[PDB]
Amino acid sequence: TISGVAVVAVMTSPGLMFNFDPYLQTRARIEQLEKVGHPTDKIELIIMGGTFPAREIEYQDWFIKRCLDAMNERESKSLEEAQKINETAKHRCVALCIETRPDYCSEKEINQMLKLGATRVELGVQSIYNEILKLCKRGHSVEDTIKATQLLKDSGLKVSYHLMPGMPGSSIEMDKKMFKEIFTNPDFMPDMVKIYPCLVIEGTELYEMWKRGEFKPYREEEAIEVISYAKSIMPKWVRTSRIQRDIPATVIVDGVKKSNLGELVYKYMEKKGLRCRCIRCREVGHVYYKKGILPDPEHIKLVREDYEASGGTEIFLSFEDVKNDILIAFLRLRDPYKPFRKEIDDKTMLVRQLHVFGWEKALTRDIKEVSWQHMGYGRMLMKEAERIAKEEFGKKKILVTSGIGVREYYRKLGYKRVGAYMGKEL
């Protein structure tokens, strides 16, 4: 199904076809999407590799500048100019996700990521168990993941965990406990998770372990059991990725090779009566595609759910059809714990995310065009966030983590640039 936001994923230098040129990769993806009539006025830029924050700042600044240059369709003198231009370009960068190892997520690196316009950070967590991490000779600890998570949350950023069921030393029950722990231990509480079973690819450490008889990866049945359990307990405030991989089956030495793992999981959950209520399962566009129904306006309500995370409080505000359990929009509001950014006081609330599910063309369903933006849901969630911040938590200013290409939207709501954020005095 076609989304209103175009995902443009690019690869950093040690993809192959363009010798890792940031501009060429970004341009080629945009043109490829325009070829098949997908909208490209809103772009989520994804920096792939996981080592980008460890590269020279000169390289990072230039790489993001050139991506924005491709979106702007013109050269710029500097990162900051490319960002300013992009605020009103035809192809706006509404979100920027950087993948990183959890030990490459210091305050200094977070400052740099904010400078670049980052709105989401994906940590290569893999496992929350130090036994498993050291057994596979990973370069980080769970303590790194916990600290990274806190620093990211207290800087207003969205946090994603890449997680790998079925690593060496793990078990079905251990993996299930990991997912339970990630959603009920405040040290974790990620906003989104990307899950795929551990695979055996030639030329990796896991391949060496496999050859020695130290590692037998999950088959489909094990992966489906774990992921089905994980989805059955995922909170309503967690967003999951489409279960998939961009790794061809002719490179998987051992492990799950089939390409419909997500569909297999769905059918397993049907058979077992396991319900899914996380964001992807309930979002208006996916429900329509999967079940053919739309929100019932007689039952749309503003809903709130709070939880403790990284020493502070997360407030998850949503508009939802509460009869049919269909999610229309949401806002992530946080009372921070131990911020370090100069713009975040102990009288500051953080709007870490505002998302109104918009234009969506379901080719396989017959109401083709469906949208929920420009209906007032975003503004009503922002107003409720401001009221909660001021009246309930006694805060005096509210800072919004804004994509470069979304700053204008918050200006319309009375926000102004405050350092790396869009802010408003309450």
Numbering used by the authors: 74 to 87, 123 to 534
Q: What do the paper's sentences say?
A:
Elp3 acts as the catalytic subunit, but the loss of any of the six subunits results in hypo-modified U34 tRNAs in yeast, indicating that the complete integrity of the complex is important for its function. The enzymatically active Elp3 subunit of Elongator contains two functional domains, utilizes multiple cofactors, and conducts a unique uridine base modification specifically found only at the wobble base position of tRNAs.
In our MinElp3 structures, we could not locate any bound Zn-ions and instead observed the formation of a disulfide bond between C384 and C389. We have previously reported that the ASL of (Dmc)tRNAGluUUC is not sufficient to bind to bacterial DmcElp3. In agreement with this data and the described importance of the extended N-terminus in MinElp3, we observed that the central basic cleft of MinElp3 is not sufficient for efficient ASL binding. The affinity between the truncated MinElp3Δ1–46 protein and the ASL alone are comparable to the one of an unspecific polyU sequence towards full length MinElp3.
